[PDB]
Design a protein around this ligand. Structure first.
Ligand code: GQM
Ligand code: GQM
Ligand code: GQM
Ligand code: GQM
Ligand code: ZN
Ligand code: ZN
Ligand code: ZN
Ligand code: ZN
Lengths: 360, 360
């Protein structure tokens, strides 16, 4: 079976399980089951599934070099798919709640979930809650007897928590730290002294890289019982490196990729986000360029946004991006080499992850 | 040590643990640690702690009849307190997100968390997320080596999930089921045919009773290694019965307890909630009374709200409440008797829970 066909079929299985359980144990009625089915589909489907399919791809790499009965190969692939869906549902949770938090308009060429007419924020917050609850239901049901259940749940929790910490770092990135205070409405920074590479790296590390790269990789290992074919410190280093890059790309596309192509109108400039573009601009700007950035950043006025975009283009950030990209390629190749020492197989999956990221 | 002194001290311990971990492992800075400390205090403290102290009280009952080294007694009490805080933080999660979902104004005589000037919804949704993530961090850290870790995590998950299902039943209780549809803005029901005792019971069972009564009771058992001193089906029956009652009280106070005393301006009438008062009114009203209810319920206009309140008073619902209360007392006494067969101790804790509920 091709991997994607298998992955999508398990989605239907998992869906039917969750909805059937709601009828047999939770007293749901058909109409609310239908609401949840449509919520699930709308929030979990339609992306490229690279998080969830990474779990599958890691597990397939190990299958090709490990002796197993056919039943065991099927069981391992089924587990990789369920694990993959846990990650996809965890992302769906994030995206639902983030969209509400940020007052987002579109996601993937469609309205954000909370903006559907029959949803509203009042339901959507709870819908996002359920999305994450379903990850746990999956794990407890499908992995009940599995030796990796404990490690998998613990890993999941830590990644989840890192992710929520990262959302806090992200939504607070345009405040001055010493001014954070729940009793006082938070002004945007005037100095941008916290728009640094180290601070940007901290935001992106927690908000994206743990769930997008570390979790799929380590889940692949756990469902394969292969965590001893790797030096976990290298797996973390390479996840954080590739994850940072992925985010830098995301940050550039927010500003420069056409809305029709991005699936949304990017608003990082208006939201005063600590983006790669802002940090890199401030790292090379002269005093006049910095003053014009401060007078125009974080404003809804389209004229000021166009002025920030012009400031980025004139500063030739595409060159800083190339240099960044070169250094990442260098370091990713290095870590892949270090990973070959203990597992060629896992190194190869990491190469594939890098290819999918670098060439998207 | 008195139970409450112990419980509150463990709060300080757990707080310091969580904040210290954020500095050592999550790269937090002092100011964001301070934000989280104040969030924690504001959202987790200030109630009566009957959920969390139930865990302690169950565990203390078992200590009085089970032989143990002094170190083991301290360890069991410490675990009961940590478990109790897991439940309190889980409630804090619910309350933060529910307040945002419902556009609530006050909670416990103070602004809802999201309404603090330096919070906003954008942070508060995530703050609520973290609150629940901290429950898991507690469990994995404090119960790492414990034999009950698995059962406790599994129990927690199921209760959490039941709770989120119950929030969906609650916020959808004024829609007609057959009209639920994420593509279509949801009209309030005109017939109120779904305002029935069985439907009300389903809402309250999931939204309140699993986390408020079932979880504290069963956690008390688990940290005591005493789950075989009870018939779990009786524990569930008695939790659901007492929990229903607790909610009925809550529903009556929303309408009739002065705002200064309730700690908020109750809005169940305006929100068209499926409350005990509405269901009981519709169960006894004549055709004219039902028509006047339909023309005035679920409206912000204070005149219509005063008309619904008058309709409840004239219908002598305090009498239906007494009869309900009598039947609950009867059934609770019966279940306590059935629980004595296997554990006098646990039966007594359940009597105390009932006393605290019935006499609040
Ligand atoms: C774990 O590896 C990956 C690899 C690539 C991507 C990707 C490419 C376009 N969107 N997402 C990902 O989310 C995870
Ligand atoms: C002015 O800033 C930029 C920076 C980077 C890029 C980029 C990177 C890969 N493709 N395009 C860009 O289009 C504009
Ligand atoms: C598990 O037992 C209880 C007993 C009583 C209460 C109560 C009384 C006033 N608020 N809450 C509770 O939340 C849980
Ligand atoms: C008109 O409806 C009611 C129903 C019940 C009560 C009640 C129950 C315990 N104390 N008070 C009430 O004050 C008004
Ligand atoms: Zn966001
Ligand atoms: Zn972005
Ligand atoms: Zn609510
Ligand atoms: Zn209420």
């Amino acid at each position: 079976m091709a991997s994607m066909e298998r992955f999508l079929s398990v989605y239907d299985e998992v869906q039917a399980f969750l909805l059937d359980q709601l009828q047999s144990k939770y007293e749901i009625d058909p109409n609310r089951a239908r609401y949840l089915r449509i919520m699930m589909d709308t929030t979990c489907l339609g992306g490229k599934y690279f998080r969830g399919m990474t779990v599958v791809n890691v597990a397939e790499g190990f299958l090709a070099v490990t002796q197993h009965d056919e039943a065991t190969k099927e069981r391992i692939l089924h587990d990789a798919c369920v694990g993959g869906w846990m990650i996809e549902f965890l992302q769906a949770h994030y995206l639902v709640e983030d969209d509400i938090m940020d007052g987002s308009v579109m996601r993937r060429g469609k309205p954000c979930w909370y903006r559907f007419p029959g949803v509203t924020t009042q339901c959507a917050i709870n819908d996002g809650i359920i999305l994450k609850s379903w990850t746990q239901i999956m794990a407890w049901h499908y992995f009940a007897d599995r030796p990796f259940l404990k490690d998998l749940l613990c890993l999941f929790q830590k990644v989840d928590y890192a992710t929520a910490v990262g959302q806090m770092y992200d939504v607070t990135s345009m405040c001055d730290s010493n001014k954070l205070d729940p009793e006082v409405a938070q002004p945007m920074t005037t100095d941008f002294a916290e728009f640094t590479p180290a601070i940007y790296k901290r935001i992106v590390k927690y908000k994206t890289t743990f769930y997008t790269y570390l979790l799929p990789l380590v889940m692949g290992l756990l469902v394969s019982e292969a965590a001893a074919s790797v030096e976990m410190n290298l797996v973390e280093r390479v996840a954080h490196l590739i994850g940072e890059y992925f985010q830098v790309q995301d940050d550039v596309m927010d500003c420069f990729t056409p809305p029709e192509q991005l699936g949304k109108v990017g608003t990082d400039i208006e939201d005063a986000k600590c983006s790669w573009l802002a940090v890199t601009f401030l790292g090379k700007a002269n005093a006049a360029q910095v003053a014009e950035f401060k007078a125009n950043y974080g404003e809804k006025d389209p004229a000021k946004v166009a002025v920030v975009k012009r400031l980025y283009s004139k500063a030739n950030l595409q060159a800083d991006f190339a240099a960044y990209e070169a250094e990442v390629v260098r370091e990713v190749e290095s870590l892949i080499e270090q990973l070959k020492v203990k597992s060629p197989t896992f190194a190869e999956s990491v190469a594939v992850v890098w290819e999918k990221t670098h060439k998207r």
